Protein backbone atom coordinates (compact mmCIF):
# COMPACT_ATOMS: atom_id res chain seq x y z
CA UNK A 1 0.00 0.00 0.00
CA UNK A 2 2.97 2.33 -0.28
CA UNK A 3 2.74 4.35 -3.46
CA UNK A 4 5.61 5.87 -5.37
CA UNK A 5 4.78 9.41 -4.36
CA UNK A 6 4.20 8.79 -0.67
CA UNK A 7 6.42 10.31 1.97
CA UNK A 8 9.28 8.25 3.31
CA UNK A 9 9.23 7.48 7.01
CA UNK A 10 10.05 10.25 9.44
CA UNK A 11 13.28 10.17 11.39
CA UNK A 12 12.55 10.06 15.09
CA UNK A 13 14.22 11.46 18.16
CA UNK A 14 16.77 9.26 19.89
CA UNK A 15 18.99 9.99 22.86
CA UNK A 16 22.03 8.37 24.43
CA UNK A 17 22.52 4.66 24.90
CA UNK A 18 24.93 2.07 26.23
CA UNK A 19 23.94 -1.58 26.19
CA UNK A 20 24.03 -4.97 24.54
CA UNK A 21 22.08 -4.18 21.41
CA UNK A 22 24.46 -4.02 18.48
CA UNK A 23 23.39 -1.99 15.47
CA UNK A 24 26.81 -0.94 14.26
CA UNK A 25 28.30 -4.40 14.09
CA UNK A 26 27.23 -7.09 11.67
CA UNK A 27 28.66 -9.25 8.93
CA UNK A 28 28.41 -8.63 5.21
CA UNK A 29 29.68 -12.07 4.31
CA UNK A 30 26.19 -13.30 5.02
CA UNK A 31 25.17 -11.29 2.00
CA UNK A 32 22.88 -8.96 3.89
CA UNK A 33 23.21 -5.20 4.05
CA UNK A 34 22.71 -3.80 7.52
CA UNK A 35 19.49 -1.84 7.50
CA UNK A 36 20.45 1.01 9.78
CA UNK A 37 19.04 4.48 10.19
CA UNK A 38 20.72 7.48 11.75
CA UNK A 39 19.25 6.96 15.20
CA UNK A 40 21.09 3.68 15.52
CA UNK A 41 24.50 5.30 15.59
CA UNK A 42 23.88 8.93 16.45
CA UNK A 43 21.58 11.01 18.59
CA UNK A 44 18.96 12.56 16.36
CA UNK A 45 15.88 14.74 16.51
CA UNK A 46 12.24 14.25 15.62
CA UNK A 47 11.95 15.11 11.96
CA UNK A 48 8.86 15.05 9.79
CA UNK A 49 10.17 13.85 6.46
CA UNK A 50 8.58 15.24 3.33
CA UNK A 51 10.56 13.78 0.48
CA UNK A 52 9.32 10.96 -1.70
CA UNK A 53 10.68 8.54 -4.25
CA UNK A 54 8.17 9.78 -6.77
CA UNK A 55 10.80 10.46 -9.39
CA UNK A 56 12.66 7.18 -9.29
CA UNK A 57 9.95 4.64 -9.96
CA UNK A 58 10.64 2.35 -12.89
CA UNK A 59 7.87 4.08 -14.77
CA UNK A 60 9.33 7.50 -14.12
CA UNK A 61 12.89 6.47 -14.83
CA UNK A 62 11.97 5.32 -18.30
CA UNK A 63 9.31 7.93 -18.91
CA UNK A 64 11.21 9.38 -21.82
CA UNK A 65 11.81 8.70 -25.49
CA UNK A 66 15.27 8.06 -26.84
CA UNK A 67 16.73 8.26 -30.32
CA UNK A 68 17.31 4.66 -31.26
CA UNK A 69 18.38 5.11 -34.85
CA UNK A 70 18.70 7.62 -37.65
CA UNK A 71 17.41 6.50 -41.01
CA UNK A 72 18.34 7.92 -44.38
CA UNK A 73 16.25 8.24 -47.51
CA UNK A 74 16.21 10.48 -50.55
CA UNK A 75 14.50 11.53 -53.75
CA UNK A 76 16.92 12.20 -56.56
CA UNK A 77 16.47 13.04 -60.22
CA UNK A 78 15.01 10.69 -62.79
CA UNK A 79 18.18 10.84 -64.85
CA UNK A 80 20.14 9.34 -61.99
CA UNK A 81 22.53 6.43 -62.20
CA UNK A 82 22.20 5.15 -58.66
CA UNK A 83 18.78 4.05 -57.51
CA UNK A 84 16.59 6.14 -55.26
CA UNK A 85 17.46 5.51 -51.63
CA UNK A 86 15.12 3.64 -49.33
CA UNK A 87 16.09 2.79 -45.79
CA UNK A 88 15.70 -0.52 -44.02
CA UNK A 89 16.39 -0.84 -40.32
CA UNK A 90 16.04 -3.76 -37.97
CA UNK A 91 14.23 -2.85 -34.78
CA UNK A 92 16.64 -2.80 -31.88
CA UNK A 93 17.49 -0.69 -28.87
CA UNK A 94 21.15 -1.49 -29.30
CA UNK A 95 22.40 0.84 -32.00
CA UNK A 96 22.45 3.74 -29.59
CA UNK A 97 23.91 3.64 -26.11
CA UNK A 98 22.08 5.84 -23.65
CA UNK A 99 18.80 3.97 -23.76
CA UNK A 100 20.50 0.60 -23.88
CA UNK A 101 22.33 1.02 -20.60
CA UNK A 102 19.21 2.13 -18.78
CA UNK A 103 17.47 -0.97 -20.04
CA UNK A 104 20.52 -2.90 -18.97
CA UNK A 105 20.15 -2.11 -15.29
CA UNK A 106 17.88 -5.12 -15.43
CA UNK A 107 17.85 -8.62 -16.83
CA UNK A 108 14.25 -8.76 -17.97
CA UNK A 109 11.49 -6.29 -18.68
CA UNK A 110 7.91 -5.89 -19.83
CA UNK A 111 6.70 -2.76 -21.56
CA UNK A 112 4.52 -1.31 -24.27
CA UNK A 113 6.53 0.74 -26.72
CA UNK A 114 5.58 4.18 -27.93
CA UNK A 115 7.40 5.34 -31.03
CA UNK A 116 7.71 8.83 -32.41
CA UNK A 117 9.06 9.88 -35.78
CA UNK A 118 10.82 13.18 -36.30
CA UNK A 119 11.54 13.83 -39.95
CA UNK A 120 14.10 16.17 -41.43
CA UNK A 121 14.71 17.04 -45.05
CA UNK A 122 17.22 19.01 -47.08
CA UNK A 123 18.47 20.00 -50.50
CA UNK A 124 21.88 18.66 -51.45
CA UNK A 125 22.81 19.95 -54.87
CA UNK A 126 23.74 23.60 -55.09
CA UNK A 127 20.99 24.57 -57.48
CA UNK A 128 17.87 26.70 -57.62
CA UNK A 129 15.33 24.08 -58.59
CA UNK A 130 12.31 23.19 -56.51
CA UNK A 131 10.67 20.42 -54.54
CA UNK A 132 7.09 19.89 -53.46
CA UNK A 133 6.29 18.82 -49.93
CA UNK A 134 7.07 15.19 -49.30
CA UNK A 135 5.11 12.35 -47.77
CA UNK A 136 6.90 9.45 -46.15
CA UNK A 137 5.54 5.97 -45.64
CA UNK A 138 7.09 4.03 -42.81
CA UNK A 139 5.97 0.44 -43.16
CA UNK A 140 6.61 -2.11 -40.47
CA UNK A 141 7.80 -5.37 -41.94
CA UNK A 142 7.59 -8.12 -39.37
CA UNK A 143 9.84 -11.14 -39.63
CA UNK A 144 8.55 -13.24 -42.49
CA UNK A 145 6.93 -10.58 -44.62
CA UNK A 146 8.45 -9.48 -47.90
CA UNK A 147 11.06 -6.78 -47.48
CA UNK A 148 11.17 -4.22 -50.25
CA UNK A 149 13.81 -4.42 -52.94
CA UNK A 150 12.72 -1.37 -54.87
CA UNK A 151 11.29 1.96 -53.82
CA UNK A 152 8.52 1.00 -56.20
CA UNK A 153 7.82 -2.69 -55.78
CA UNK A 154 4.66 -4.44 -54.64
CA UNK A 155 5.50 -4.49 -50.95
CA UNK A 156 4.67 -0.86 -50.33
CA UNK A 157 1.04 -1.68 -50.91
CA UNK A 158 0.68 -2.71 -47.29
CA UNK A 159 -2.33 -4.96 -46.88
CA UNK A 160 -1.40 -6.22 -43.45
CA UNK A 161 1.89 -4.57 -42.58
CA UNK A 162 1.43 -1.53 -40.39
CA UNK A 163 2.47 1.58 -42.24
CA UNK A 164 2.67 5.25 -41.42
CA UNK A 165 1.97 8.03 -43.87
CA UNK A 166 3.80 11.11 -42.69
CA UNK A 167 3.39 14.44 -44.40
CA UNK A 168 6.41 16.65 -43.98
CA UNK A 169 5.99 19.80 -41.94
CA UNK A 170 3.49 18.40 -39.49
CA UNK A 171 3.42 16.79 -36.07
CA UNK A 172 5.98 14.03 -35.84
CA UNK A 173 4.55 10.55 -36.22
CA UNK A 174 3.65 8.49 -33.18
CA UNK A 175 2.28 5.01 -32.70
CA UNK A 176 1.95 2.45 -29.94
CA UNK A 177 2.79 -1.22 -29.86
CA UNK A 178 2.03 -3.67 -27.08
CA UNK A 179 4.33 -6.13 -25.39
CA UNK A 180 5.26 -8.12 -28.46
CA UNK A 181 7.81 -10.51 -27.02
CA UNK A 182 7.92 -14.19 -27.83
CA UNK A 183 8.91 -14.75 -24.23
CA UNK A 184 7.06 -13.63 -21.14
CA UNK A 185 9.32 -10.62 -20.92
CA UNK A 186 11.99 -9.10 -23.12
CA UNK A 187 15.40 -10.49 -22.34
CA UNK A 188 18.29 -8.07 -22.31
CA UNK A 189 20.97 -10.68 -21.79
CA UNK A 190 20.87 -14.21 -23.10
CA UNK A 191 23.37 -16.73 -21.83
CA UNK A 192 23.15 -19.18 -24.69
CA UNK A 193 22.79 -19.70 -28.41
CA UNK A 194 20.17 -20.63 -30.97
CA UNK A 195 21.44 -23.95 -32.25
CA UNK A 196 22.89 -26.99 -30.55
CA UNK A 197 25.93 -28.30 -32.35
CA UNK A 198 25.57 -32.06 -32.45
CA UNK A 199 28.27 -34.68 -32.65
CA UNK A 200 27.00 -36.26 -35.83
CA UNK A 201 26.63 -32.99 -37.68
CA UNK A 202 29.20 -30.70 -39.24
CA UNK A 203 30.53 -27.94 -37.04
CA UNK A 204 29.33 -25.56 -39.70
CA UNK A 205 25.83 -26.98 -39.51
CA UNK A 206 25.79 -26.57 -35.76
CA UNK A 207 27.13 -23.09 -35.16
CA UNK A 208 25.25 -20.06 -33.91
CA UNK A 209 26.07 -16.73 -32.33
CA UNK A 210 26.56 -16.47 -28.60
CA UNK A 211 23.72 -14.61 -26.94
CA UNK A 212 21.75 -14.44 -30.16
CA UNK A 213 18.17 -15.60 -30.35
CA UNK A 214 14.75 -14.88 -31.78
CA UNK A 215 13.79 -13.36 -28.46
CA UNK A 216 14.95 -10.16 -30.09
CA UNK A 217 13.93 -10.36 -33.72
CA UNK A 218 11.14 -7.90 -34.37
CA UNK A 219 11.59 -7.42 -38.09
CA UNK A 220 12.47 -4.19 -39.83
CA UNK A 221 11.20 -0.70 -40.52
CA UNK A 222 11.13 0.32 -44.15
CA UNK A 223 10.74 3.89 -45.31
CA UNK A 224 10.72 5.85 -48.54
CA UNK A 225 9.59 9.20 -49.86
CA UNK A 226 6.25 8.61 -51.50
CA UNK A 227 6.94 11.36 -53.99
CA UNK A 228 7.97 10.49 -57.52
CA UNK A 229 11.33 11.46 -58.94
CA UNK A 230 12.09 15.14 -58.57
CA UNK A 231 14.48 17.11 -60.75
CA UNK A 232 16.61 18.33 -57.87
CA UNK A 233 17.51 15.80 -55.22
CA UNK A 234 16.29 16.05 -51.65
CA UNK A 235 17.77 14.28 -48.66
CA UNK A 236 15.87 13.24 -45.57
CA UNK A 237 16.38 11.66 -42.18
CA UNK A 238 13.86 10.02 -39.89
CA UNK A 239 14.85 10.02 -36.25
CA UNK A 240 13.08 7.40 -34.19
CA UNK A 241 12.43 7.79 -30.49
CA UNK A 242 11.40 4.95 -28.24
CA UNK A 243 9.65 5.28 -24.91
CA UNK A 244 8.94 2.17 -22.90
CA UNK A 245 5.73 3.01 -21.10
CA UNK A 246 3.84 0.82 -18.68
CA UNK A 247 7.11 -0.81 -17.71
CA UNK A 248 8.09 -3.68 -15.46
CA UNK A 249 11.56 -4.96 -14.64
CA UNK A 250 13.44 -7.92 -13.23
CA UNK A 251 16.83 -8.69 -11.75
CA UNK A 252 19.18 -5.78 -11.30
CA UNK A 253 22.54 -5.84 -13.02
CA UNK A 254 25.48 -3.49 -12.72
CA UNK A 255 25.51 -0.77 -15.34
CA UNK A 256 27.77 -0.84 -18.36
CA UNK A 257 31.11 0.53 -17.26
CA UNK A 258 33.09 0.26 -20.46
CA UNK A 259 31.81 1.63 -23.74
CA UNK A 260 29.82 -0.86 -25.76
CA UNK A 261 31.22 -2.81 -28.68
CA UNK A 262 28.53 -4.52 -30.71
CA UNK A 263 25.15 -5.77 -29.58
CA UNK A 264 26.74 -8.21 -27.18
CA UNK A 265 28.65 -7.77 -23.96
CA UNK A 266 32.02 -7.64 -25.65
CA UNK A 267 34.51 -4.85 -25.15
CA UNK A 268 37.61 -3.75 -27.00
CA UNK A 269 41.20 -2.98 -26.10
CA UNK A 270 42.06 0.33 -24.52
CA UNK A 271 38.52 1.19 -23.53
CA UNK A 272 38.83 -0.82 -20.35
CA UNK A 273 39.89 2.18 -18.31
CA UNK A 274 36.89 3.80 -16.67
CA UNK A 275 38.33 5.24 -13.49
CA UNK A 276 40.73 8.14 -13.34
CA UNK A 277 43.53 8.95 -10.93
CA UNK A 278 42.98 9.45 -7.22
CA UNK A 279 45.29 9.06 -4.27
CA UNK A 280 44.20 7.14 -1.21
CA UNK A 281 44.91 9.86 1.30
CA UNK A 282 43.34 12.89 -0.30
CA UNK A 283 39.86 14.35 -0.39
CA UNK B 1 38.38 -7.38 -31.31
CA UNK B 2 37.40 -8.32 -34.83
CA UNK B 3 34.15 -10.16 -34.28
CA UNK B 4 31.52 -9.89 -31.57
CA UNK B 5 29.48 -12.60 -29.89
CA UNK B 6 32.04 -14.91 -31.41
CA UNK B 7 32.60 -17.51 -28.72
CA UNK B 8 31.74 -21.03 -29.79
CA UNK B 9 29.46 -23.40 -27.93
CA UNK B 10 32.29 -25.65 -26.87
CA UNK B 11 34.30 -22.88 -25.27
CA UNK B 12 31.23 -21.27 -23.78
CA UNK B 13 30.29 -24.43 -21.96
CA UNK B 14 33.26 -26.03 -20.26
CA UNK B 15 30.95 -27.95 -17.98
CA UNK B 16 32.00 -29.10 -14.54
CA UNK B 17 35.55 -27.86 -14.77
CA UNK B 18 34.24 -24.38 -15.42
CA UNK B 19 36.45 -21.48 -16.38
CA UNK B 20 38.52 -18.63 -15.02
CA UNK B 21 38.82 -14.87 -15.12
CA UNK B 22 41.89 -12.93 -16.17
CA UNK B 23 43.53 -9.70 -15.08
CA UNK B 24 44.55 -8.61 -18.55
CA UNK B 25 42.51 -8.54 -21.73
CA UNK B 26 44.13 -10.44 -24.55
CA UNK B 27 42.57 -10.02 -27.96
CA UNK B 28 42.99 -12.98 -30.26
CA UNK B 29 44.83 -11.94 -33.39
CA UNK B 30 44.72 -15.32 -35.07
CA UNK B 31 42.36 -14.46 -37.88
CA UNK B 32 43.01 -17.74 -39.63
CA UNK B 33 41.56 -19.99 -36.96
CA UNK B 34 40.38 -17.85 -34.08
CA UNK B 35 40.20 -19.11 -30.53
CA UNK B 36 36.55 -18.22 -30.14
CA UNK B 37 36.54 -18.19 -26.36
CA UNK B 38 35.78 -15.84 -23.52
CA UNK B 39 38.30 -13.42 -22.09
CA UNK B 40 36.57 -12.31 -18.93
CA UNK B 41 38.42 -9.51 -17.21
CA UNK B 42 38.13 -9.74 -13.45
CA UNK B 43 37.56 -6.14 -12.48
CA UNK B 44 34.87 -5.76 -15.10
CA UNK B 45 33.39 -9.01 -13.89
CA UNK B 46 33.98 -10.29 -17.39
CA UNK B 47 30.91 -8.48 -18.63
CA UNK B 48 32.04 -4.89 -18.89
CA UNK B 49 30.73 -3.87 -15.51
CA UNK B 50 32.73 -3.10 -12.40
CA UNK B 51 33.04 -6.03 -10.04
CA UNK B 52 32.22 -3.63 -7.24
CA UNK B 53 28.54 -3.59 -8.07
CA UNK B 54 28.52 -7.36 -8.28
CA UNK B 55 26.85 -7.24 -4.90
CA UNK B 56 23.60 -6.41 -6.63
CA UNK B 57 23.38 -10.10 -7.38
CA UNK B 58 22.53 -12.49 -4.58
CA UNK B 59 25.85 -13.24 -2.94
CA UNK B 60 28.02 -14.13 0.01
CA UNK B 61 31.65 -13.69 0.99
CA UNK B 62 33.86 -16.50 2.18
CA UNK B 63 36.07 -14.42 4.43
CA UNK B 64 38.43 -16.91 6.00
CA UNK B 65 38.29 -15.31 9.42
CA UNK B 66 34.57 -15.80 9.77
CA UNK B 67 33.41 -18.42 7.34
CA UNK B 68 34.43 -21.55 5.51
CA UNK B 69 31.47 -21.74 3.18
CA UNK B 70 28.84 -19.90 1.20
CA UNK B 71 25.38 -21.27 0.60
CA UNK B 72 22.98 -19.82 -1.93
CA UNK B 73 19.58 -21.09 -2.95
CA UNK B 74 18.67 -20.14 -6.49
CA UNK B 75 15.23 -20.49 -8.01
CA UNK B 76 14.67 -21.02 -11.71
CA UNK B 77 15.12 -17.72 -13.49
CA UNK B 78 14.42 -16.99 -17.12
CA UNK B 79 12.16 -14.96 -19.37
CA UNK B 80 9.95 -18.01 -19.61
CA UNK B 81 8.59 -20.84 -17.53
CA UNK B 82 10.78 -23.51 -19.06
CA UNK B 83 13.59 -23.51 -21.59
CA UNK B 84 16.08 -25.77 -23.32
CA UNK B 85 18.77 -26.28 -20.73
CA UNK B 86 20.98 -27.72 -23.42
CA UNK B 87 20.92 -24.47 -25.35
CA UNK B 88 20.69 -22.03 -22.48
CA UNK B 89 22.26 -21.35 -19.11
CA UNK B 90 20.11 -19.53 -16.60
CA UNK B 91 22.54 -18.96 -13.77
CA UNK B 92 26.25 -18.31 -13.51
CA UNK B 93 28.56 -18.93 -10.59
CA UNK B 94 31.32 -16.40 -10.13
CA UNK B 95 33.95 -16.73 -7.44
CA UNK B 96 36.59 -14.05 -7.16
CA UNK B 97 39.03 -13.29 -4.38
CA UNK B 98 38.07 -9.90 -3.03
CA UNK B 99 41.01 -9.96 -0.66
CA UNK B 100 44.21 -11.82 -1.41
CA UNK B 101 45.19 -15.20 -0.05
CA UNK B 102 48.00 -15.02 2.46
CA UNK B 103 49.34 -17.31 5.14
CA UNK B 104 51.83 -16.52 7.86
CA UNK B 105 54.86 -15.45 5.87
CA UNK B 106 55.12 -18.07 3.15
CA UNK B 107 55.38 -17.19 -0.51
CA UNK B 108 53.08 -19.64 -2.24
CA UNK B 109 50.24 -20.85 -0.06
CA UNK B 110 47.37 -22.94 -1.36
CA UNK B 111 43.88 -23.76 -0.20
CA UNK B 112 41.37 -25.85 -2.10
CA UNK B 113 37.92 -24.67 -3.07
CA UNK B 114 35.08 -27.05 -3.77
CA UNK B 115 31.59 -26.69 -5.16
CA UNK B 116 28.71 -29.06 -4.60
CA UNK B 117 25.53 -28.26 -6.46
CA UNK B 118 22.04 -29.63 -6.16
CA UNK B 119 19.09 -29.15 -8.48
CA UNK B 120 15.80 -28.44 -6.79
CA UNK B 121 12.30 -28.94 -8.12
CA UNK B 122 13.73 -30.62 -11.18
CA UNK B 123 11.33 -31.06 -14.06
CA UNK B 124 11.51 -31.83 -17.76
CA UNK B 125 9.27 -32.15 -20.78
CA UNK B 126 9.34 -33.12 -24.43
CA UNK B 127 10.99 -36.48 -24.00
CA UNK B 128 12.67 -37.75 -27.13
CA UNK B 129 15.88 -39.34 -28.32
CA UNK B 130 19.31 -38.75 -26.85
CA UNK B 131 21.07 -35.48 -27.54
CA UNK B 132 24.72 -35.97 -28.42
CA UNK B 133 26.29 -32.54 -28.55
CA UNK B 134 29.79 -31.87 -29.79
CA UNK B 135 31.59 -30.73 -26.67
CA UNK B 136 35.04 -30.44 -28.18
CA UNK C 1 6.49 -18.13 -38.92
CA UNK C 2 10.01 -18.14 -40.25
CA UNK C 3 12.50 -20.97 -40.39
CA UNK C 4 14.33 -20.48 -37.11
CA UNK C 5 16.50 -22.35 -34.67
CA UNK C 6 15.48 -20.77 -31.40
CA UNK C 7 11.85 -21.33 -32.25
CA UNK C 8 12.38 -24.71 -33.86
CA UNK C 9 9.45 -27.09 -33.70
CA UNK C 10 10.86 -30.58 -34.00
CA UNK C 11 10.60 -33.49 -36.38
CA UNK C 12 7.76 -35.51 -37.84
CA UNK C 13 8.48 -39.01 -39.10
CA UNK C 14 6.78 -42.11 -40.45
CA UNK C 15 8.14 -45.63 -40.33
CA UNK C 16 7.10 -49.18 -41.07
CA UNK C 17 6.21 -51.10 -37.94
CA UNK C 18 5.70 -54.43 -39.62
CA UNK C 19 5.47 -54.06 -43.37
CA UNK C 20 2.72 -53.88 -45.94
CA UNK C 21 1.29 -57.29 -46.66
CA UNK C 22 -1.01 -58.26 -49.48
CA UNK C 23 -2.13 -61.55 -50.96
CA UNK C 24 -1.60 -62.63 -54.53
CA UNK C 25 -3.47 -60.81 -57.26
CA UNK C 26 -3.20 -57.63 -55.25
CA UNK C 27 -1.34 -54.45 -56.11
CA UNK C 28 2.00 -54.67 -54.37
CA UNK C 29 2.50 -50.94 -54.11
CA UNK C 30 0.08 -48.37 -52.81
CA UNK C 31 -0.02 -44.79 -51.61
CA UNK C 32 -0.96 -42.82 -48.52
CA UNK C 33 -2.52 -39.42 -48.06
CA UNK C 34 -1.67 -37.03 -45.26
CA UNK C 35 -3.57 -34.18 -43.69
CA UNK C 36 -2.71 -31.54 -41.13
CA UNK C 37 -4.81 -29.15 -39.10
CA UNK C 38 -4.87 -27.17 -35.90
CA UNK C 39 -6.45 -28.19 -32.63
CA UNK C 40 -9.07 -26.23 -30.74
CA UNK C 41 -6.28 -24.50 -28.88
CA UNK C 42 -4.23 -23.14 -31.74
CA UNK C 43 -3.69 -19.42 -32.12
CA UNK C 44 -1.78 -16.89 -34.17
CA UNK C 45 -0.72 -13.29 -33.78
CA UNK C 46 1.01 -10.33 -35.37
CA UNK C 47 -0.56 -9.67 -38.74
CA UNK C 48 1.81 -9.39 -41.67
CA UNK C 49 1.72 -9.63 -45.44
CA UNK C 50 2.42 -12.99 -47.01
CA UNK C 51 5.24 -13.74 -49.40
CA UNK C 52 3.49 -16.48 -51.34
CA UNK C 53 1.86 -13.78 -53.39
CA UNK C 54 3.31 -10.92 -55.40
CA UNK C 55 2.87 -8.48 -58.25
CA UNK C 56 5.68 -7.83 -60.68
CA UNK C 57 5.53 -4.23 -61.82
Amino acid at each position, epitope marked *: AATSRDALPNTEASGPTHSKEIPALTAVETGATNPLVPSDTVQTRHVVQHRSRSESSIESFFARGACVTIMTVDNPASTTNKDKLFAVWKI*TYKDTVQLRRKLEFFTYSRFDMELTFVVTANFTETNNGHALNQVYQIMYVP*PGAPVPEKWDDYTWQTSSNPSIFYTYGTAPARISVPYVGISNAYSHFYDGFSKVPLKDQSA*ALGDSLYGAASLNDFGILAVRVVNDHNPTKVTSKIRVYLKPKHIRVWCPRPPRAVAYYGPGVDYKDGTLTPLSTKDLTTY | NTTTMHTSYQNANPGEKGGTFTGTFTPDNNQTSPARRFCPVDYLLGNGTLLGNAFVFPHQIINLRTNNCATLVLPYVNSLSIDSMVKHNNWGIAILPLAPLNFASESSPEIPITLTIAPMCCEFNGLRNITLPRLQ | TIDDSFTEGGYISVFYQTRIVVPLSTPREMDILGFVSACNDFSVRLLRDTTHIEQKA
Partner: nanobody
Amino acid sequence: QVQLQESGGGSVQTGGSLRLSCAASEYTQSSACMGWFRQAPGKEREGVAGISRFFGTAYYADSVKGRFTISQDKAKNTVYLQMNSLKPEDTAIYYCAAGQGCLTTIQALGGAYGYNAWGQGTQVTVSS
Protein backbone atom coordinates in the same frame (compact mmCIF):
# COMPACT_ATOMS: atom_id res chain seq x y z
CA GLN D 1 13.29 -20.81 -47.00
CA VAL D 2 14.40 -18.51 -49.79
CA GLN D 3 15.00 -20.63 -52.86
CA LEU D 4 18.72 -21.18 -53.11
CA GLN D 5 19.47 -22.89 -56.38
CA GLU D 6 22.99 -22.72 -57.74
CA SER D 7 24.89 -23.74 -60.85
CA GLY D 8 28.03 -23.01 -62.81
CA GLY D 9 30.36 -25.98 -62.79
CA GLY D 10 32.93 -25.24 -65.45
CA SER D 11 36.32 -26.85 -65.05
CA VAL D 12 38.47 -24.04 -66.37
CA GLN D 13 42.24 -23.99 -66.50
CA THR D 14 44.50 -22.12 -64.12
CA GLY D 15 43.91 -18.45 -64.81
CA GLY D 16 40.46 -18.24 -66.31
CA SER D 17 37.25 -16.49 -65.34
CA LEU D 18 34.24 -18.22 -63.87
CA ARG D 19 30.85 -17.00 -62.74
CA LEU D 20 28.75 -18.45 -59.96
CA SER D 21 25.17 -17.59 -59.17
CA CYS D 22 22.64 -18.45 -56.50
CA ALA D 23 18.95 -17.67 -56.60
CA ALA D 24 17.48 -15.62 -53.80
CA SER D 25 14.23 -14.47 -55.33
CA GLU D 26 11.82 -15.00 -52.47
CA TYR D 27 12.27 -12.31 -49.88
CA THR D 28 12.44 -13.77 -46.40
CA GLN D 29 14.65 -11.92 -43.96
CA SER D 30 16.86 -12.00 -47.02
CA SER D 31 20.41 -13.20 -47.40
CA ALA D 32 22.37 -10.41 -45.79
CA CYS D 33 26.04 -10.71 -46.62
CA MET D 34 24.88 -13.86 -48.34
CA GLY D 35 27.63 -16.44 -48.27
CA TRP D 36 29.92 -18.59 -50.35
CA PHE D 37 31.53 -21.66 -48.87
CA ARG D 38 33.95 -24.02 -50.52
CA GLN D 39 34.65 -27.54 -49.36
CA ALA D 40 38.01 -28.88 -50.45
CA PRO D 41 37.92 -32.64 -50.07
CA GLY D 42 41.39 -32.40 -48.60
CA LYS D 43 40.34 -29.81 -46.07
CA GLU D 44 36.78 -29.02 -45.09
CA ARG D 45 34.13 -26.36 -45.45
CA GLU D 46 35.18 -22.73 -45.29
CA GLY D 47 33.78 -19.26 -45.76
CA VAL D 48 34.81 -17.03 -48.63
CA ALA D 49 32.81 -14.11 -49.94
CA GLY D 50 29.95 -11.86 -48.92
CA ILE D 51 28.23 -8.56 -49.54
CA SER D 52 25.54 -7.18 -47.29
CA ARG D 53 21.93 -7.36 -48.37
CA PHE D 54 21.59 -3.63 -48.81
CA PHE D 55 24.84 -2.16 -47.59
CA GLY D 56 28.31 -2.44 -49.04
CA THR D 57 29.65 -4.72 -46.35
CA ALA D 58 31.54 -7.24 -48.41
CA TYR D 59 33.98 -9.44 -46.55
CA TYR D 60 36.73 -11.23 -48.40
CA ALA D 61 38.76 -14.22 -47.30
CA ASP D 62 42.48 -13.61 -47.17
CA SER D 63 43.04 -16.06 -49.98
CA VAL D 64 40.61 -14.57 -52.46
CA LYS D 65 40.66 -10.80 -52.15
CA GLY D 66 40.83 -8.84 -55.37
CA ARG D 67 40.54 -11.86 -57.61
CA PHE D 68 37.19 -12.96 -56.25
CA THR D 69 34.44 -10.39 -55.97
CA ILE D 70 30.85 -10.54 -54.80
CA SER D 71 27.91 -8.70 -56.28
CA GLN D 72 24.24 -9.31 -56.93
CA ASP D 73 21.09 -8.03 -58.56
CA LYS D 74 18.89 -6.13 -56.15
CA ALA D 75 15.97 -6.95 -58.39
CA LYS D 76 16.53 -9.88 -60.69
CA ASN D 77 17.51 -11.60 -57.48
CA THR D 78 20.46 -13.90 -57.93
CA VAL D 79 23.92 -13.62 -56.43
CA TYR D 80 26.92 -13.38 -58.70
CA LEU D 81 30.48 -14.34 -57.91
CA GLN D 82 33.26 -13.22 -60.21
CA MET D 83 36.18 -15.57 -59.76
CA ASN D 84 39.10 -14.61 -61.94
CA SER D 85 42.72 -15.65 -62.21
CA LEU D 86 41.93 -19.06 -60.81
CA LYS D 87 44.60 -21.02 -59.00
CA PRO D 88 44.61 -24.78 -58.73
CA GLU D 89 44.24 -24.23 -55.01
CA ASP D 90 40.64 -23.15 -55.41
CA THR D 91 39.35 -26.48 -56.64
CA ALA D 92 36.45 -27.17 -54.33
CA ILE D 93 32.70 -27.45 -54.09
CA TYR D 94 31.11 -24.06 -53.66
CA TYR D 95 27.94 -23.24 -51.79
CA CYS D 96 25.71 -20.23 -51.33
CA ALA D 97 24.62 -19.21 -47.86
CA ALA D 98 21.59 -17.31 -46.64
CA GLY D 99 22.21 -15.34 -43.48
CA GLN D 100 18.80 -13.99 -42.56
CA GLY D 101 18.36 -11.08 -40.19
CA CYS D 102 20.94 -8.71 -41.58
CA LEU D 103 22.41 -8.20 -38.14
CA THR D 104 23.58 -11.76 -38.60
CA THR D 105 26.11 -10.35 -41.01
CA ILE D 106 26.62 -7.09 -39.17
CA GLN D 107 27.55 -8.44 -35.77
CA ALA D 108 29.92 -11.08 -37.08
CA LEU D 109 30.11 -9.37 -40.43
CA GLY D 110 31.14 -12.59 -42.10
CA GLY D 111 28.70 -15.43 -42.55
CA ALA D 112 29.02 -18.94 -41.20
CA TYR D 113 27.38 -18.42 -37.84
CA GLY D 114 24.14 -16.78 -38.86
CA TYR D 115 23.28 -19.02 -41.76
CA ASN D 116 20.17 -21.15 -41.94
CA ALA D 117 19.43 -21.98 -45.55
CA TRP D 118 22.00 -24.11 -47.31
CA GLY D 119 22.82 -24.26 -50.99
CA GLN D 120 23.15 -27.18 -53.36
CA GLY D 121 26.77 -27.27 -54.42
CA THR D 122 28.72 -26.79 -57.62
CA GLN D 123 31.95 -28.53 -58.48
CA VAL D 124 34.66 -26.25 -59.76
CA THR D 125 37.98 -27.66 -60.89
CA VAL D 126 40.91 -25.46 -61.81
CA SER D 127 43.57 -27.72 -63.24
CA SER D 128 46.45 -28.24 -65.62
